């Protein structure tokens, strides 16, 4: 009976909660109390990247740590030479409501998507001099909110149809559809080894998925409301989430629980972007109050603020060699920090 | 102090900047409008009429471009989105106006429509965004209340103790009953509006049948008023 199934679900959920309660023998604070506080970090706007007409929702660093793709709601992707602030490419988009972008690890492609429900893929390195649309991937019902290239032929898209998908770029069709969320999936972070990935939705729950077997492997809870950003710790055995309940939270896949929560009483805006440094000792979060906060992830004290932006910080990305951090906001500007 | 290839790279960047300025010059000259409504609300027919008079399977948004009096408008409506709205609505907190088409010839889903309008009005991101609500399908409502089969008073008890405000203007000449009922619905929506307007944003009621060709001019006039208000706030004239 339906009552029987519901009772079984409650029983298994209680069993999971009990196992999680048993496994938590010490807080990360209790063990991290030993670690010396990082200290205040002052990061300065080394470069300011002007040229976007409207607000920015997305940016992705290149694996060469110098090029930079940025997505604005005016209908542009701009590829910056971050060292010299030159504009390398200016890619006009077919739908202006872009709200994600990715930069292929090889550097031959960038992706973008938004309210059009499409993940368009752009070919940067053509024999002709221009940047052309390589493929348009269709099949999601809700909007696209994040995309991340696994390699030059496989991309993973999260959507607001409660579904993340894995695509074959050569043969447009989907290869795996990841179902199990009950709200809009907002962010997405591929693991370093690219065999797994996590996605946070609008149901306050995040899930570690399996790219090859196609099935959700874990589910994590603890947030009070919908999750806006997610990112892997450089280890690959953890991830941090920022949500509209004004908190960041650090889950761990092996313990399958929550480790620490990054919150302050005076901060009531929702986190919009989360990214780590190389060591993982600094958790950088972009908030709605126009400032990105810097959190010492091991002990959850505020270590830095980067209040240069006027309007809300929508995107935030740390480069692969850890040299710089870039922040894009709704004031049409990108800021590179050291 | 920098090599010749860097001269040419800087020249390339400068041409890109010039193109970006040429794009800004037209980005400031177009106004963005978000269209909202329900399945029974005739907003699709409104879009069709606006496209016809002025100026692909699961695509999630339909941008319609129209102009009037040499001013360019871009009206966007979500086509393949889900029922949830609290996230992809944060993307529209800088549009000129929000057009909310409601079908007022149901009496049944109408309370759901008021709930939706209230959810839109009080949204933490849609402040300072005026709403242009279109009470759609008025002639259907007129005929359906001439029929008299469905009593409005049972769906809404307060309609019995209601009378037409003095500010009415029935132009063609119709039954005072239809005017009283339609102004009652308009006044329900306006009560929801003025409950928390606080002068930051406004609501512009209209009586619209999707066959009407004056919809675009109504949007234009309301947008002109909204721009005038934000300029009065901006040039510090108020």
């Amino acid at each position: 009976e339906l009552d029987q199934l519901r009772q079984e679900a409650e029983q298994l959920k209680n069993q999971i909660r009990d196992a999680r309660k048993a496994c938590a023998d010490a807080t990360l604070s209790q063990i991290t109390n030993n670690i010396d506080p990082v200290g205040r970090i002052q990061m300065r706007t080394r470069r300011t990247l002007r040229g976007h007409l409207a607000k920015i929702y997305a940016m992705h660093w290149g694996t060469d740590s110098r090029l930079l793709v940025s997505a604005s709601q005016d209908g542009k992707l701009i590829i910056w030479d971050s060292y010299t602030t030159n504009k390398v490419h200016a890619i006009p988009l077919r739908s202006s409501w872009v709200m994600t972008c990715a930069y292929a690890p090889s550097g031959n492609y960038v992706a973008c998507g938004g309210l059009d429900n499409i993940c368009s893929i752009y070919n940067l390195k053509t024999r002709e001099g221009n940047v052309r649309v390589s493929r348009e991937l269709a099949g999601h019902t809700g909007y696209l909110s994040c995309c991340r290239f696994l390699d030059d032929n496989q991309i993973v898209t999260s959507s607001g149809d409660t579904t993340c998908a894995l695509w074959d770029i050569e043969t447009g069709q989907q290869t795996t559809t990841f179902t199990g969320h009950t709200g809009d999936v907002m962010s997405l972070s591929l693991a370093p080894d690219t065999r797994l990935f996590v996605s946070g939705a609008c149901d306050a729950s995040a899930k570690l998925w399996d790219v090859r077997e196609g099935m959700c492997r874990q589910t994590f809870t603890g947030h009070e409301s919908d999750i806006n950003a997610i990112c892997f710790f450089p280890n690959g055995n953890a991830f941090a989430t920022g949500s509209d309940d004004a908190t960041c939270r650090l889950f761990d896949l092996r313990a399958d629980q929550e480790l620490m929560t990054y919150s302050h009483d005076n901060i009531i805006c929702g986190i919009t972007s989360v990214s780590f440094s190389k060591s993982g000792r600094l958790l950088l979060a972009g908030y709605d109050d126009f400032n990105c906060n810097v959190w010492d992830a091991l002990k959850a004290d505020r270590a830095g603020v980067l209040a240069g932006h006027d309007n809300r910080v929508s995107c935030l990305g740390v480069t692969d060699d850890g040299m710089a951090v870039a922040t894009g906001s709704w004031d049409s500007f990108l800021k590179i920090w050291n | 102090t920098l090599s010749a290839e860097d001269k040419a790279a800087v020249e390339r960047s400068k041409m890109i900047e010039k193109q970006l300025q040429k794009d800004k010059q037209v980005y400031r000259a177009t106004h963005r409008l978000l269209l909202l409504g329900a399945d029974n609300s005739g907003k699709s027919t409104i879009v069709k009429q606006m496209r016809i008079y002025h100026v692909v399977k699961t695509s999630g948004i339909f941008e319609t471009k129209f102009q009037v009096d040499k001013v360019n408008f871009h009206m966007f409506d979500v086509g393949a989105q889900r029922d949830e709205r609290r996230k992809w609505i944060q993307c529209f907190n800088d549009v000129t106006a929000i057009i909310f088409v409601v079908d007022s010839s149901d009496y049944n889903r109408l309370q759901e429509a008021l709930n939706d309008f209230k959810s839109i009005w009080n949204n933490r991101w849609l402040r300072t965004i005026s709403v242009i609500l279109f009470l759609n399908k008025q002639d259907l409502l007129a005929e359906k209340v001439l029929a008299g089969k469905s009593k409005i008073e049972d769906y809404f008890p307060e309609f019995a103790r209601y009378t037409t405000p003095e500010d009415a203007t029935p132009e063609p000449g119709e039954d005072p009953r239809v005017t009283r009922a339609k102004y009652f619905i308009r006044d329900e929506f306006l009560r929801i509006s003025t409950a928390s307007g606080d002068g930051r944003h406004y609501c512009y009621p209209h009586f619209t049948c999707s066959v009407d060709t004056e919809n675009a001019r109504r949007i234009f006039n309301d947008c002109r008023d909204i721009i005038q208000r934000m300029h009065l706030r901006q040039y510090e004239l108020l």
Partner: single-chain antibody
Amino acid sequence: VQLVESGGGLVQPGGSRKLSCSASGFAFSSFGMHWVRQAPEKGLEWVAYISSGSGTIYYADTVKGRFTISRDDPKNTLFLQMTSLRSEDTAMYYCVRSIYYYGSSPFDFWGQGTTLTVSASADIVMTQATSSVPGESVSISCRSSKSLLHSNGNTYLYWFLQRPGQSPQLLIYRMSNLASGVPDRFSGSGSGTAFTLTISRLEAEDVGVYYCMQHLEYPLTFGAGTKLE
């Protein structure tokens, strides 16, 4: 990509000619294009240069007022105007394509060339001392006067291979980067003044004349050429 060029022939001295370079198959307006010439039996020599947007124009010291370079982007052609032709202007003129941004490969395409016949300083000099040399390994060398390594970290040295019957093709740009389409056999190295190009295993299609070029500062001087037989 293809660059077909025309407008050359027998010319009486003191006359004038206008060369053209009709381009098809690439975004012409975003490429800065050069004219390079070579005397019937000598090495290549740079002539002029016009930039994207037509804002930067350079000329050789030997054509500084005699010549005039101009482009027509909508018509997608490149022109070179020549006045008061002398007997040192007998050469085949090449149309070269070059785009400049981070990571780009300038001089990556060369046109087939046009022949022009005329009837009867403080710039970097690069010398290829060797003038001649299947399955073996060859190590064509090169030398320069001023150091080519810039403060950027780049070493603006280019390698071109001219097969016995056609136009040069780019093999290595900025001393280390193999161009698109060149096999993995070719590789380049250097230090700032002395450079070398390595072919790991020859083939019957690797025979020709190897030319070097510097892009550090205009004019672009080339080098005599190394022959493989």
